[PDB]
From a paper:
Carbamoyltransferases (CTases) catalyze carbamoylation, an important modification for the bioactivity of many secondary metabolites with pharmaceutical applications. CTases in class III, which modify secondary metabolites, adopt two nucleophilic half-reactions, the formation of carbamoyl-AMP derived from ATP, CP, and Mg2+ and the subsequent transfer of the carbamoyl group from carbamoyl-AMP to the secondary metabolites. GdmN forms a face-to-face homodimer through unusual C-terminal domains, a previously unknown functional form for CTases.
Intriguingly, a water molecule (W′) interacting with the hydroxy group of Y82 appears near H27 in all experimental data, forming hydrogen-bonding interactions with the backbone amide and carbonyl of H27. Y82 was highly conserved in this subclade, and replacing Y82 with Phe abolished the activity, revealing the importance of Y82 in making water-mediated (W′) hydrogen bonds. To interpret the role of Y82, we determined the structure of mutant Y82F (2.30 Å resolution) and found it similar to that of apo GdmN, with the major difference occurring in loop 1.
Author numbering:
A (entry chain A): 1 to 674
B (entry chain B): 1 to 679
The structure:
C-alpha cells in the first residue's frame, strides 16, 4: 500500500502557468509518501528549487520521495491532492479569465501532465483522488499523535469552504463536530495584521516573535472592535466594505502608520503585535474551552497553519483544558499534502495508520554516502580546508564550549519549518551577546528576533516549565517559560518575556544531536544549545551538500560539521574555480527608461528572480557582460578572461550575488546520485 | 466662483505610486473647471498622456483647463475631489501595506504635492474639499439636464458606500431616496461577465456591441440563478465563496469556455453577451419602474458609468416610464470629477448652476490658431500635402459623396468617450461595406462592432424612431430603432437588430458639423454620415494637431480635414525627418532568460509601456541599438546613420512601433502655446 500526497500549484520550473495566484493555500508545495501506513519520505519543494515557500508543482519532491522509498512511479497505488477538484478548477478558471492567454487546462490534466513529462509516469485517472482540505489536515495531525481518540482542531487561512474545523477522532475515523466560515479566518486575520508591519505571507511567526516586546494594552480596545466572542464557543469577525483587509481601516482611522520595508519597529509596532497575539489567543482558547467540555475529550491534536503559532500552543498547554496536546512538525499546507495521502488510502480500502507517535521529522533526502561526500568536499578544496576527527561530535561540543558558532548538517533533512539537528546552526546558549551577534552577523535579521533552545530530555525540567498538559516538544511546537532561576544562565535563548520555543531532544528523537547536547552539558554544566535553522536570509533551509557548503561560505559561521567532516573557510578562497549557473528563474536585464527632454535614459543593468515577490539587484556593466556569457560549464575565472580577468571588484560583486542566491556557484561536477 | 473638479489617482507622469491599484474607480482621470455655474473647460488626462482611461494624476488636464479659462492657479476658489477623504486614504493605506516600500503619503498631501511641483500652485488646505461620490455623479447629470426637478439614478462600479443611488433633484438640492450596497454592483456584474469573453476593464462597450449578435434564450436560466428581483425595487446578486467574480463559477460548472486571447467569438460567447445585456436591462428597468411609481416623477437623469450602456438607455427611453430622459456625455468617473466641483461650491456657500441644458461636449483644448496650425503643418511637409480650399466644408461634403473616408478635426475636443464632430472619422453611411472597410483598415478592430450615425435635427425623425420619451441625442447616449423602411438605405450604420446609437446634430449643438451633414444630404439625398472616433486601436481620441496628423499618417484614411486645411499623405513619406522621443512610460530592454542547460539564454530585445496592462513588442538588435541613442532632438534619419542608415526594413519596423505608439514621432519643434482665439 504505497500512496503519494501532493499540495501546491501546477507551474513548471521556469514558467508560471499564471503570474499571480491570488490565493494563500498554494504555498509550501511538498510531496509525502506513505507505505503501509507509515510516512517514509517527505520533503518540501522549497528545499529543492530554493524558492522560500514556493507554489511550484512539487516535481523534484516527488522524485526524491520515490528514491528514498526505493519505489518506482508504477509502484504507487494512489495519489491524494490536498483540495477538492471542483474548488481548485473553479479557482483556475477564474485565473484564466484574468489571464486570457493561458490555455484552458484544469488541475487533473495539469497534474498528470507534470507527472508524465517530469517522471515518465502515466497516472490513470482513477488513481488521482481529491480530498477535503481540512480532512487532510486532520488526518496528518491526528494519525501521527500516537493517540487513539482525541479532539482535532484545524485552523488555517482557508480550505474549500471553511477557515476552521473541529473533529472527533477515534481509531481511524474522523467525525466533524463544528466548522467556521471563511470570513471568520484567524489565519486571515493574523495575515491581514502582518501586512501592517511591512511583512507578507510567511512572516506571521516573525510578528509572533515581535509580540513579547509590546504592551498588549495599547491596542486592546481597538482589536476588540474587530471580533466578538459569542455563546457556545462561537465568535464573529467584523468586516468592512472598504478594502480586502479586516484590520487596516480601523487602525488607519486612529493614526497607526504601517511600517515601511527596511525601517525599524517602533514601540507602536510592538504594541500592535502584542495586541494581535493576545486577540488570537483569546479567540482560540474560547473555541477550545467550549469544545473540550462539550466533546468530553482530554486529548487535543491541533493542526492547520495557525498551529505554527508557538506562543498560542504554549497558552493552550498552560490552560489546563487538556491533559495531552500534539502538534505535527509540518502543520501548514505541506502537512495537508501528507494527510491527502491517508485520505486517498482510506477511499481505496481500510486505512493503515502509523504504529507510534512521530518523534523525528528527519524525512527528506540525505546528504550522501561517506565516499561521495568526501570526494565532493575535495572538489571544493580551493575554498575550504577539511579535517576528519576521530569523534566529530566530541570535537563539535568542545568547539561550542570555546564560543564557536557551528553549522551542523547530518542525515535526512527536516520536514516542516523548524531545524531540529539535521540542518541547524548551533552555539552556546548562555551569553546574551550570542543572540545579538547571530541576529546581526550570522542570520542577518532583525534584532528583536528570539532564538530557540534545544535541551536534553534528561535536563529539560531543570531549565523549562513544561507543566500543565503533556505536549510534544520534539519539533519546537510549544513556547514555554524558562524557569526564573535559569533565565540569567540562558541569556541567548530566553525571550524578553522569559519564554523559549523549546526543542527537547532524546536519544529516540535524534540520537546524534542528543549526544552533542549532552556532551556540551558535561563540558560546561549547561546541556542547552541555541538552535537556529541552517540558512541565510535569502534561502530556505539548506538541503544538499553543495547547499550546505555554499551557505557555510556565504554566512559568517566559524566552522561547519557535515557528516563527521570539519570544514573551515580558506584564508583566501579561489572564487575563480566556481562554475556559474542560472537558476531556472534567473533573469538578466539591460534597461532604459525615459530621460530628460524625452530622451532615452542611461543604461542600467539588473539581475532578478522571476517569481511573485522575487528579489532584484543592480549589476555593473562589466558583470552584466560576464554574466551574459554564462554557459553552465566554464568556470568564473575562465569566463572573466573576456572582460579582462577576474578582478577583485568582480569577485566581490559576484560574491554578493551568490550570497543573495541570484545564481548558482559550485565547483565543476556534482556529488552524483545518493 | 472658479472651482476645479478632480478625479483619478495620484501618480506622476513617469512613475506609479504603486504598481496595481486594485480598484475600478481611479480610471478616466480628468480635470473640470466651473465658473459662475457653467462648465467652462473639461478634458480627460488620457487625451494628454495618450494612455487610454489612465489613472494618473490629471496634472496636464488641470493645466489645460486653467489656460482655457484664462486663470492663474491662484484664481481658483475651491478644489473638489470626487470621493470622501477617509475612504480614499483608507484605500491608499491598504495599498501601502501591500507595497511596503511606498512612503506614507495620503491624498491631501499628494494632491498638494502634484499641484505645487506641476504648476507652482500652493493649494491652501481649506480650499480642498472631498465629496460623496454618488452626489458628484448626481450633480453632474442633473445640473446639465436643464430640468428643474427630476428623478436621478446613479449606477456604477462603486462609490465609497454604494453601487447605486436614487435621488430626487429640485433646484440645486439633492435628496437621497434609496441606495444599493457595493456587492450588488451592476457595473461589477457587467465587468465580471466581460472577463469571460477575453476582455477586461474598459471593454464593456465592446461586449454591449456583441450582444445583438447573440440569442438571449441560451443562458437566460443560468443568469437567473445569479440574481433575484424583489419587492420595492430591490434585487439581490447571489455571491460565492470561491473567487472574486460573481459569474465565472456557475458558468464553469455548466461547461462555458472563456474566450482566449486572439480567438474568435464562438456562438456560445455571443449568446452569453446577449443574456448578460438582457439581465442588466431587466434589473435596471425593475429599479426604475419602482422609483418612477413611488416618486411620481416624469423626468429622469441617469448617471454613473453604467449610463454609458446606450442599449440600456434606449430601453429606458422606450419604456414609457418617463416623459424626458437626460444623460451626460461623460457619465463615468470623469463626470463625477466635474460634479465634485459643483459639490465643493455648494459645500462652501450657495450653488450656481448652468442656465441651460448642455448641448455640446466640445470642452477640451483646441488645436491652435490659423497661423500656428499652418506653420506646424509646414513642419510636416516631407510627409503630407496640404491644400487650402475656399469652403473646406463644401469640399469635404463632396469628397464624402464620392466615397472617401475622412478624418475631421476642428476646435475643442469632446469631453467623454464619444466623438461628435471635433475629433471624428466620417464617411458615407449608405454602403454596407463601409463597415468592413473602416473596421478593418482604419480602426483594425472586430467586425461585429457597429458604427454610429450622425443626422441633422431636421432629418432625424425621417430615419430613426425617437419615441417613448424626449431623450437628449446630442451625445449618442441612446440606441434607437432605425425605421424599417430606411434600414437598407443606411447600410453602414444599422446594427443586426436594426438599431443605431444616433447623434442628432443641430445648428446649436455643433454649427460646423451640422452644416457638413446637411450639405452632404443636399448632395446625396441622405443627410446622415457615419461618425466614429478619431483614433486607431492603440490610442485614445486624438487631441493636438500632431496627434491628428500622426493618427492620419498611421491609418488608411483618404483625406484629413483639420481646421479648414485639407491634408493628404505624400507618395513616399520621409520618416527620416521625424524626431523620435520616448514617452514617460516608454521602456527599452534587453533580456536574458535561463537556458535549458542552466546557461544564460540568448538575448532578446523589447520595447514596452510601463503602466498596468501596457503593451510590449519585440524589436530587432539594430533597432534596439538605434532607439538607445534617442536624445529627443536628433532626427530618426540621423540616428539611423550609426547603424548603417535608415533602410526600408528599419523604416518599416519603426513605422509599426509608431502605429502602436511605443514612442513619439513628430517633426522637430512644437506648435507652441495654443493661441488665444478670442473665446
Ligand atoms: Fe491549510
Ligand atoms: Fe463612479
Amino acid at each position: 500500500m504505497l500512496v503519494l500526497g501532493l499540495n501546491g500549484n501546477f507551474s513548471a520550473a521556469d514558467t508560471d502557468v499564471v503570474p499571480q495566484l491570488g490565493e494563500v493555500f498554494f504555498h509550501d508545495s511538498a510531496a509525502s509518501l506513505i507505505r503501509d501506513g507509515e510516512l517514509v519520505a517527505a520533503v518540501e519543494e522549497e528545499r529543492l528549487n530554493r524558492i522560500k515557500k514556493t507554489t511550484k508543482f512539487p516535481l523534484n519532491a516527488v522524485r526524491e520521495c520515490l528514491a528514498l522509498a526505493g519505489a518506482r512511479p508504477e509502484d504507487v497505488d494512489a495519489v491524494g491532492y490536498f483540495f477538492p477538484e471542483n474548488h481548485i478548477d473553479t479557482v483556475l478558471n477564474h485565473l484564466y479569465t484574468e489571464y486570457p492567454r493561458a490555455p484552458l487546462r484544469y488541475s487533473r490534466e495539469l497534474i498528470r501532465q507534470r507527472l508524465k513529462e517530469g517522471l515518465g509516469w502515466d497516472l490513470p485517472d482513477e488513481k488521482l483522488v481529491y480530498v477535503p482540505h481540512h480532512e487532510a489536515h486532520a488526518y496528518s495531525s491526528y494519525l501521527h499523535s500516537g493517540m487513539d481518540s482525541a479532539l482535532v482542531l484545524v485552523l488555517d487561512g482557508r480550505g474549500e469552504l471553511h477557515s476552521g474545523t473541529v473533529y472527533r477522532a477515534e481509531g481511524t475515523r474522523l467525525e466533524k463536530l463544528a466548522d467556521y466560515p471563511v470570513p471568520k479566518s484567524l489565519g486571515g486575520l493574523y495575515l491581514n495584521a502582518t501586512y501592517l508591519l511591512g511583512y507578507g505571507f510567511g512572516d506571521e511567526y516573525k510578528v509572533m516573535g515581535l509580540a513579547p516586546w509590546g504592551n498588549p494594552e495599547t491596542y486592546r480596545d481597538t482589536f476588540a472592535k474587530l471580533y466578538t466572542l459569542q455563546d457556545n464557543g462561537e465568535y464573529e469577525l467584523h468586516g468592512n466594505i472598504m478594502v480586502p483587509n479586516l484590520v487596516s481601516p480601523l487602525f488607519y482611522a486612529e493614526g497607526f502608520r504601517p511600517r515601511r520595508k527596511g525601517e525599524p519597529f517602533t514601540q507602536a509596532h510592538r504594541d500592535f503585535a502584542a495586541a494581535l497575539q493576545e486577540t488570537v489567543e483569546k479567540i482560540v482558547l474560547h473555541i477550545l474551552e467550549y469544545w473540550a467540555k462539550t466533546s468530553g475529550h482530554s486529548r487535543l491534536c491541533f493542526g492547520g497553519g495557525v498551529a505554527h503559532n508557538s506562543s498560542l500552543n504554549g497558552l493552550i498547554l498552560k490552560s489546563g483544558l487538556f491533559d495531552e496536546v500534539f502538534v505535527h512538525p509540518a502543520s501548514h499546507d505541506a502537512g495537508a499534502g501528507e494527510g491527502a495521502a491517508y485520505a486517498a488510502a482510506a477511499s481505496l480500502g481500510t486505512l493503515e495508520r502509523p504504529g507510534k507517535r512521530l518523534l523525528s521529522a528527519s524525512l527528506g533526502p540525505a546528504l550522501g554516502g561517506r565516499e561521495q561526500i568526501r570526494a565532493r568536499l575535495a572538489d571544493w578544496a580551493p575554498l575550504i580546508d577539511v579535517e576528519f576527527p576521530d569523534d566529530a561530535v566530541e570535537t563539535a561540543a568542545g568547539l561550542l564550549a570555546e564560543g564557536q558558532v557551528l553549522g551542523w548538517a547530518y542525515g535526512r533533512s527536516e520536514f516542516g519549518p523548524r531545524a531540529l539537528g539535521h540542518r541547524s546552526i548551533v552555539a552556546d546558549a548562555r551569553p546574551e551577546e550570542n543572540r545579538t551577534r547571530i541576529n546581526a552577523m550570522v542570520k542577518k535579521r532583525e534584532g528583536f528576533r528570539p532564538f530557540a533552545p534545544v535541551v536534553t530530555a534528561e535536563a529539560a525540567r531543570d531549565y523549562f516549565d513544561l507543566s500543565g498538559a503533556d505536549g510534544n516538544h520534539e519539533f519546537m511546537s510549544f513556547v514555554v517559560p524558562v524557569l526564573p532561576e535559569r533565565r540569567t544562565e540562558l541569556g541567548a535563548v530566553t525571550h524578553v518575556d522569559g519564554t523559549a520555543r523549546v526543542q527537547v531532544v532524546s536519544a529516540e528523537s535524534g540520537e546524534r544531536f542528543h549526544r552533542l547536547v549532552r556532551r556540551f552539558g558535561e563540558l560546561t554544566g549547561t546541556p542547552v544549545l541555541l538552535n537556529t535553522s541552517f540558512n541565510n536570509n535569502a534561502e530556505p533551509i539548506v538541503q544538499s551538500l553543495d547547499d550546505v557548503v555554499t551557505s557555510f561560505l556565504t554566512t559568517d559561521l566559524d566552522v561547519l560539521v557535515v557528516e563527521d567532516c570539519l570544514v573551515r573557510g580558506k584564508a583566501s578562497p579561489d572564487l575563480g574555480v566556481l562554475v556559474p549557473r542560472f537558476r531556472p528563474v534567473t533573469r538578466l536585464v539591460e534597461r532604459r527608461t525615459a530621460g530628460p527632454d524625452a530622451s532615452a535614459g542611461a543604461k542600467t543593468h539588473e539581475i532578478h528572480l522571476d517569481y511573485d515577490g522575487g528579489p532584484s539587484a543592480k549589476v555593473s556593466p562589466e558583470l552584466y557582460e560576464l554574466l551574459g556569457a554564462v554557459d553552465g560549464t566554464t568556470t568564473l575565472g575562465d569566463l572573466a578572461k573576456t572582460v579582462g580577468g577576474l578582478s577583485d571588484a568582480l569577485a566581490t560583486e559576484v560574491f554578493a550575488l551568490w550570497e543573495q542566491r541570484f545564481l548558482t556557484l559550485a565547483p565543476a561536477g556534482d556529488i552524483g546520485p545518493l
